[PDB]
Every structure is written in C-alpha cells, then in structure tokens.
Scaffold this motif. Sequence first.
Motif, PDB file in Angstrom:
ATOM      1  N   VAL A 186       0.831  -1.201   0.000  1.00 51.01           N
ATOM      2  CA  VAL A 186       0.000   0.000   0.000  1.00 51.01           C
ATOM      3  C   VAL A 186       0.866   1.251   0.000  1.00 51.01           C
ATOM      4  CG1 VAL A 186      -1.451   1.370   1.534  1.00 51.01           C
ATOM      5  CG2 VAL A 186      -2.138  -0.892   0.885  1.00 51.01           C
ATOM      6  N   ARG A 187       1.840   1.318   0.904  1.00 52.61           N
ATOM      7  CA  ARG A 187       2.675   2.507   0.970  1.00 52.61           C
ATOM      8  C   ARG A 187       3.654   2.589  -0.187  1.00 52.61           C
ATOM      9  NH1 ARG A 187       5.551   3.960   5.346  1.00 52.61           N
ATOM     10  NH2 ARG A 187       3.532   3.688   6.406  1.00 52.61           N
ATOM     11  N   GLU A 188       3.941   1.470  -0.850  1.00 50.47           N
ATOM     12  CA  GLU A 188       4.635   1.551  -2.124  1.00 50.47           C
ATOM     13  C   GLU A 188       3.714   2.086  -3.209  1.00 50.47           C
ATOM     14  OE1 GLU A 188       4.636  -1.425  -4.706  1.00 50.47           O
ATOM     15  OE2 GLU A 188       5.766  -0.111  -6.049  1.00 50.47           O
ATOM     16  N   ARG A 189       2.422   1.805  -3.106  1.00 51.18           N
ATOM     17  CA  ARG A 189       1.477   2.208  -4.133  1.00 51.18           C
ATOM     18  C   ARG A 189       0.920   3.600  -3.889  1.00 51.18           C
ATOM     19  NH1 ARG A 189      -2.751  -1.994  -6.544  1.00 51.18           N
ATOM     20  NH2 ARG A 189      -0.864  -3.184  -6.030  1.00 51.18           N
ATOM     21  N   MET A 190       0.695   3.961  -2.623  1.00 53.04           N
ATOM     22  CA  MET A 190      -0.026   5.190  -2.305  1.00 53.04           C
ATOM     23  C   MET A 190       0.790   6.424  -2.660  1.00 53.04           C
ATOM     24  SD  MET A 190      -0.823   6.446   1.601  1.00 53.04           S
ATOM     25  CE  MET A 190       0.358   5.194   2.081  1.00 53.04           C
ATOM     26  N   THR A 191       2.097   6.379  -2.422  1.00 51.53           N
ATOM     27  CA  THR A 191       2.941   7.514  -2.768  1.00 51.53           C
ATOM     28  C   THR A 191       3.108   7.654  -4.272  1.00 51.53           C
ATOM     29  OG1 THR A 191       4.979   6.239  -2.706  1.00 51.53           O
ATOM     30  CG2 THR A 191       4.163   7.127  -0.628  1.00 51.53           C
ATOM     31  N   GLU A 213      -6.310  12.034  -5.950  1.00 53.83           N
ATOM     32  CA  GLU A 213      -7.669  12.266  -6.463  1.00 53.83           C
ATOM     33  C   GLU A 213      -7.990  11.376  -7.655  1.00 53.83           C
ATOM     34  OE1 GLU A 213      -7.707  16.426  -7.121  1.00 53.83           O
ATOM     35  OE2 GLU A 213      -7.559  16.863  -4.974  1.00 53.83           O
ATOM     36  N   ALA A 214      -7.330  10.232  -7.724  1.00 54.60           N
ATOM     37  CA  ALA A 214      -7.696   9.164  -8.629  1.00 54.60           C
ATOM     38  C   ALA A 214      -7.725   7.818  -7.946  1.00 54.60           C
ATOM     39  CB  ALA A 214      -6.721   9.098  -9.810  1.00 54.60           C
ATOM     40  N   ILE A 215      -7.023   7.660  -6.836  1.00 57.73           N
ATOM     41  CA  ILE A 215      -6.982   6.381  -6.163  1.00 57.73           C
ATOM     42  C   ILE A 215      -8.268   6.179  -5.380  1.00 57.73           C
ATOM     43  CG2 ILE A 215      -4.480   6.263  -6.076  1.00 57.73           C
ATOM     44  CD1 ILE A 215      -6.055   7.050  -2.866  1.00 57.73           C
ATOM     45  N   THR A 216      -8.494   4.935  -4.998  1.00 64.09           N
ATOM     46  CA  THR A 216      -9.609   4.546  -4.158  1.00 64.09           C
ATOM     47  C   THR A 216      -9.147   3.341  -3.354  1.00 64.09           C
ATOM     48  OG1 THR A 216     -12.043   4.383  -4.229  1.00 64.09           O
ATOM     49  CG2 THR A 216     -10.799   2.874  -5.608  1.00 64.09           C
ATOM     50  N   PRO A 217      -9.842   3.001  -2.265  1.00 65.12           N
ATOM     51  CA  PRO A 217      -9.473   1.796  -1.512  1.00 65.12           C
ATOM     52  C   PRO A 217      -9.470   0.516  -2.320  1.00 65.12           C
ATOM     53  CG  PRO A 217     -11.372   2.985  -0.580  1.00 65.12           C
ATOM     54  CD  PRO A 217     -10.585   3.918  -1.399  1.00 65.12           C
ATOM     55  N   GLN A 218     -10.294   0.409  -3.360  1.00 62.29           N
ATOM     56  CA  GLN A 218     -10.151  -0.718  -4.271  1.00 62.29           C
ATOM     57  C   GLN A 218      -8.839  -0.654  -5.038  1.00 62.29           C
ATOM     58  OE1 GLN A 218     -12.972  -2.762  -4.081  1.00 62.29           O
ATOM     59  NE2 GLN A 218     -11.566  -4.314  -4.878  1.00 62.29           N
ATOM     60  N   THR A 219      -8.336   0.547  -5.311  1.00 54.64           N
ATOM     61  CA  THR A 219      -7.093   0.661  -6.059  1.00 54.64           C
ATOM     62  C   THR A 219      -5.895   0.353  -5.182  1.00 54.64           C
ATOM     63  OG1 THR A 219      -8.115   2.360  -7.432  1.00 54.64           O
ATOM     64  CG2 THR A 219      -5.729   2.152  -7.535  1.00 54.64           C
ATOM     65  N   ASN A 229      -4.180  -4.577  -2.328  1.00 56.78           N
ATOM     66  CA  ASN A 229      -3.969  -5.871  -2.960  1.00 56.78           C
ATOM     67  C   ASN A 229      -4.153  -6.940  -1.896  1.00 56.78           C
ATOM     68  OD1 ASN A 229      -1.210  -7.808  -4.188  1.00 56.78           O
ATOM     69  ND2 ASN A 229      -3.358  -7.883  -4.813  1.00 56.78           N
ATOM     70  N   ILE A 230      -5.243  -7.704  -1.998  1.00 53.43           N
ATOM     71  CA  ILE A 230      -5.554  -8.718  -0.994  1.00 53.43           C
ATOM     72  C   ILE A 230      -4.801 -10.011  -1.214  1.00 53.43           C
ATOM     73  CG2 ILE A 230      -7.785  -7.803  -0.442  1.00 53.43           C
ATOM     74  CD1 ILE A 230      -7.784 -10.647  -2.795  1.00 53.43           C
ATOM     75  N   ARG A 231      -4.101 -10.114  -2.340  1.00 55.58           N
ATOM     76  CA  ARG A 231      -3.373 -11.331  -2.683  1.00 55.58           C
ATOM     77  C   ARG A 231      -2.331 -11.773  -1.655  1.00 55.58           C
ATOM     78  NH1 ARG A 231       0.435 -12.069  -6.425  1.00 55.58           N
ATOM     79  NH2 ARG A 231       0.418  -9.793  -6.687  1.00 55.58           N
ATOM     80  N   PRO A 232      -1.537 -10.899  -1.013  1.00 52.29           N
ATOM     81  CA  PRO A 232      -0.691 -11.401   0.074  1.00 52.29           C
ATOM     82  C   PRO A 232      -1.465 -11.893   1.274  1.00 52.29           C
ATOM     83  CG  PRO A 232      -0.600  -9.051  -0.031  1.00 52.29           C
ATOM     84  CD  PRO A 232      -1.136  -9.517  -1.321  1.00 52.29           C
ATOM     85  N   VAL A 233      -2.632 -11.323   1.576  1.00 49.43           N
ATOM     86  CA  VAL A 233      -3.412 -11.801   2.714  1.00 49.43           C
ATOM     87  C   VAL A 233      -3.938 -13.203   2.451  1.00 49.43           C
ATOM     88  CG1 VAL A 233      -5.596 -11.477   3.903  1.00 49.43           C
ATOM     89  CG2 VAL A 233      -3.999  -9.613   3.697  1.00 49.43           C
ATOM     90  N   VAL A 234      -4.557 -13.406   1.285  1.00 44.32           N
ATOM     91  CA  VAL A 234      -5.137 -14.715   1.010  1.00 44.32           C
ATOM     92  C   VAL A 234      -4.042 -15.750   0.779  1.00 44.32           C
ATOM     93  CG1 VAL A 234      -5.493 -14.115  -1.413  1.00 44.32           C
ATOM     94  CG2 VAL A 234      -6.804 -15.951  -0.408  1.00 44.32           C
ATOM     95  N   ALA A 235      -2.902 -15.337   0.215  1.00 42.46           N
ATOM     96  CA  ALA A 235      -1.784 -16.254   0.080  1.00 42.46           C
ATOM     97  C   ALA A 235      -1.182 -16.595   1.428  1.00 42.46           C
ATOM     98  CB  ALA A 235      -0.721 -15.658  -0.835  1.00 42.46           C
ATOM     99  N   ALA A 236      -1.195 -15.656   2.372  1.00 39.47           N
ATOM    100  CA  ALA A 236      -0.636 -15.922   3.686  1.00 39.47           C
ATOM    101  C   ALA A 236      -1.495 -16.902   4.460  1.00 39.47           C
ATOM    102  CB  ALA A 236      -0.490 -14.619   4.460  1.00 39.47           C
TER     103      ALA A 236
END
Length: 50
Positions: free
Chosen positions: A1-6, A11-17, A20-27
Amino acid sequence: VRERMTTQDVEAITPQTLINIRPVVAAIKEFFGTSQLSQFMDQNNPLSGL
DNA sequence: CGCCCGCTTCGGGGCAACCCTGCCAGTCTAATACAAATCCGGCAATGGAGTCAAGACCAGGTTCG
C-alpha cells in the motif's frame, strides 16, 4: 500500500485501487496448507480426534 | 624512560541411534517496429521401393500303352 499510495496520482486512487488482498489470502493459504501446526486431522476413532 | 609474554575473554565451527512414513513452494507503466530465424503446408523434382501377373524350366514323383 505505501509503495502504491505515494507513487500513484492523488484524487484518482480509491481503496479498491490501493489494496492488494493477494498477500493476505496467500498468507492464510500458506498457513493452512503447509505449516507444522495445521495438521492433517488424525481420526480413526472419535477419541483420537478429540 | 617506554614496551611486549600468559591468562583471559570471545568468536566460532562440528556433532548429537537405527528401521518406516510422507510425496508438487511467487509478482508491476507497457508496449511498438523490425529483422532475421524458423516453422510449416503444399506441388513437384523425382526415384527407388514394393507389388502383380505372366511366364521359362527342370525334373520328379505320378499316370498311361
């Protein structure tokens, strides 16, 4: 997230953007499968299960 | 006057029973443009390999005067 948010534009991002839930479900999957604690549940009587 | 020989402390690697019994691990500018390589799909150079059908013949048991 902090790699992506910066990096991405404001004013284009959103919580869906940002999320990435893939590390959570993979974990969780790599805990349930393939850990020395999530055991194959031994049952050949009710007592061994209990 | 300044200068190094034994504790001494610390790092630092090796090893600590034998059978079975299992069974498959991950992600972030994205594209064009091109040249060569190479595959590959299909007629045509064959050309050689296989195949049918007829036949030439000896002679060897087998049939006849």
